Fold this protein.
Amino acid sequence: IKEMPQPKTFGELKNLPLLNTDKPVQALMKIADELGEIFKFEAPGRVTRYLSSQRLIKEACDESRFDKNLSQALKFVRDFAGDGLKTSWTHEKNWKKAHNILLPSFSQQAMKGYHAMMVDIAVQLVQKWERLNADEHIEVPEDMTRLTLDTIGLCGFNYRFNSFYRDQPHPFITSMVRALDEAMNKLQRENKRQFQEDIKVMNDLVDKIIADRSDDLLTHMLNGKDPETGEPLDDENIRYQIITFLIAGHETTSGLLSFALYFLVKNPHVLQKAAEEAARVLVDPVPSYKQVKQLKYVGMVLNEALRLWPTAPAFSLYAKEDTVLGGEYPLEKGDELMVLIPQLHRDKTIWGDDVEEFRPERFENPSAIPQHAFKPFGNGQRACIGQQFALHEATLVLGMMLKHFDFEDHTNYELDIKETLTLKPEGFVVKAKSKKIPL
Amino acid sequence: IKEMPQPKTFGELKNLPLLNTDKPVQALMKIADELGEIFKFEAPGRVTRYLSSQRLIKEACDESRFDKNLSQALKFVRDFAGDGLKTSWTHEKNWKKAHNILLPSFSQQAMKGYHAMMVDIAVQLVQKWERLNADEHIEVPEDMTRLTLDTIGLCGFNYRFNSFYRDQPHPFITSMVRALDEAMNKLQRDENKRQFQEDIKVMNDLVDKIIADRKASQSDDLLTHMLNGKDPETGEPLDDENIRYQIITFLIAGHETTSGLLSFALYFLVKNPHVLQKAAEEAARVLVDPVPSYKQVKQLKYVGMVLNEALRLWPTAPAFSLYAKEDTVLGGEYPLEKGDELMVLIPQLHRDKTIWGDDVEEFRPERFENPSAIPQHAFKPFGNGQRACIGQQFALHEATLVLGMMLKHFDFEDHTNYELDIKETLTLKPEGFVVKAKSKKIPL
Ligand code: HEM
Ligand code: HEM
Ligand SMILES: O=C(CCCCCn1ccnc1)N[C@@H](Cc1ccccc1)C(=O)O
Ligand SMILES: O=C(CCCCCn1ccnc1)N[C@@H](Cc1ccccc1)C(=O)O
């Protein structure tokens, strides 16, 4: 019925040069602003469709009609993440098998065992900031990445990256980041030689984490059995899961903490409510698990930060069979879709006309949010298995940050969103004035 | 660990005779004025604590520490509302099941289907007022009740009470009101019991009549979801017994608190002409068509602030009850044992000077310009958490639409210089509130 719009083309390259830019997600958002809820995007050897409305995305989230597709970004991540959970197809045997084995270690109930090690790294962050000299500022995304990397290293694998003891990030991050950089750079197109060297460095630490082998993920991956097949994970897939969780378990989370702190200092009314809750609830020197679940408004702050800037800003789907999207866009079996999460979260027909404003009170009552309107952690059985982990860590850390310091946007920072495969506010810096509450 | 104060006692009756008064909520507010943010209240076989400060109520709204309790009022309403949504305990299977089944029919998105029938009744209200003769006046709470009862009857169940064709209420209303009256009368204190059962039968008769007529005529309404909706957890639909209780619940819950809100809002507007002017200007600017649209109603921002400010000063469901899930300490100085009850005195909470400033009694809708500037749990006219009012958006959409049309089509005069007199049932209303409306002669 309806003919789909399409952005400007570049001859034989079609739409591909539109992604030859350092902020491709923000470029795709602007195109969505111009073209609406759906537009076709073409590249040599590829056709996909970018969805932006809750009306169409709720249909795309029907798992009986659409399954997770590996985007080109995920295909490049697969080169070192293998058939780990995030880069495996749903129909590959190792997805469901690893899913069954690892889901128990990610329950809201499983966070109780991780909590103490999360506090360990969180205290290290607070002490660094307590120990700054007068007029010394904080590099927010840099320190958040220190925290989330160390948290997943310790909580997941009882490995200490000791990022707060370094200026130059761990030998694993640079290789991982340069691999991730080559993955994203390849989308926008001796790099091949460096790509393999970085992959070896990652496989090097992974076999080092494994070699000597607690209350962590590595235990379940070495001892857990899939109740379906009765099998445990084989050694090859275990390595891929370790690589997967080290990546997936840190960078989207540090972005979330970075954006949350940005929005707080840009909205002092909100920071006051959040800081009062942290002070009222976190009455002990070390926060407990139960106290963290009580940080309701802090959780609302985090969800609203995820609304405006979801740090994993898209996911891909393919049609399981011939079907019609929205009653006017017919699709053939295998046709691909892209869900543009930042645009979905700005659907005025869902959230009202003031979508760009940071208002955590949108999330005061979760039942008021329509289905599939809010998708920062993906969809269905392929949703983010680490969702509860990420939110408990971020709630704990932001709560501790708000309890122990007042924050100043001393440079009046202008939001600049650096894009890798994830989003971060580049150059975000603050000053912290300690409230002198002991640990 | 502070010992909480307690109002005057009457021997073995303890505090109970203090409720033997025709304005008990306003009586309890005065006691709060004298005793402060918390006072114990005792009756034979009952002990509860009335909270009045945002400081303590924000803790009471922690759902991990406190759950909804059935007040004695709700226990008496349960005698004919059963395990419907409002009178069921959270741990009863039928609460979560009905909650899951009925939320889709109450989304901010679900109002789009209700909007046309809301306009149907709202136009009937405007036309009644257009048709008054000179020097005739309007009985505000009576007409607002005509409006809200007909709206929930039509929107909810495709049943027309036709209240604007009657001086005497529909037989269900008279029984329902007298049942609600007996429920409240039982609190402050026979053959009332014989009449109580007759009124319950009249209510069940209309309910069983609406079910019959629907089964002999698929609509877009509440009754449809109650007959066809499935709980996504269990896959079960509601059984017939609970369906009847939900109908009774929504007919009660869906009208009387809403008519109070409209009545109080119009009172505060005519007592504050600068506010009425701002609200009327927004109505004229936004409602540019003869029939208001759904989208235009969401654009009545100031009217919505007017409604929230009326709900601040006189929340028409003036209290709700909670019990401690486990042993806990309230405010760092009031220890509570598992099962201890609390009462949240909403009108007093909304007059907390530490939250709203020294001008708490003044009607200033601009207080609600920014929700982020309002401390947590300072404003609770629709309850708390998962047991909050499921009809909140329904109520606010209806009142915004109707108040918008009222301000568009008429100028209003407080011709008697009305003295606010708040009648108390289980809800609050401004008794005897009357105005004159001078039509602006804008066609529909
Ligand atoms: C704020 C933090 C996070 C965000 C916004 C986020 C976002 C997402 C999204 C959108 C997906 C779906 C990807 C797709 O459909 O292609 C996903 C999947 C996944 N995430 Fe996260 N994530 C976060 C934190 C974490 C953490 C902390 C972990 C590990 C502890 C993790 C591990 C995973 C895994 C393993 C998958 C693949 C699940 C599967 O397909 O079976 N994530 N994440
Ligand atoms: C201005 C109008 C209204 C006010 C002030 C109001 C107030 C409240 C309050 C305070 C509660 C919580 C009671 C408690 O905790 O014991 C509640 C619950 C409830 N209300 Fe309303 N309400 C209004 C309109 C409506 C409407 C229009 C409907 C139906 C369409 C409705 C249906 C309900 C139901 C079913 C519950 C029980 C929800 C549950 O516990 O699952 N209310 N209301
Ligand atoms: O939009 C994106 C960004 C998605 C990255 C999300 C990765 N993530 C998810 C969870 N943690 C990381 N990617 C498209 C771009 C493209 C379109 C057409 C042709 C070539 C490339 C793609 O990769 O296919
Ligand atoms: O204060 C109240 C007010 C009732 C709230 C209105 C109920 N509602 C909610 C939504 N629509 C109606 N009720 C107490 C009074 C009392 C205290 C101690 C002993 C006896 C009676 C109670 O019922 O327990």
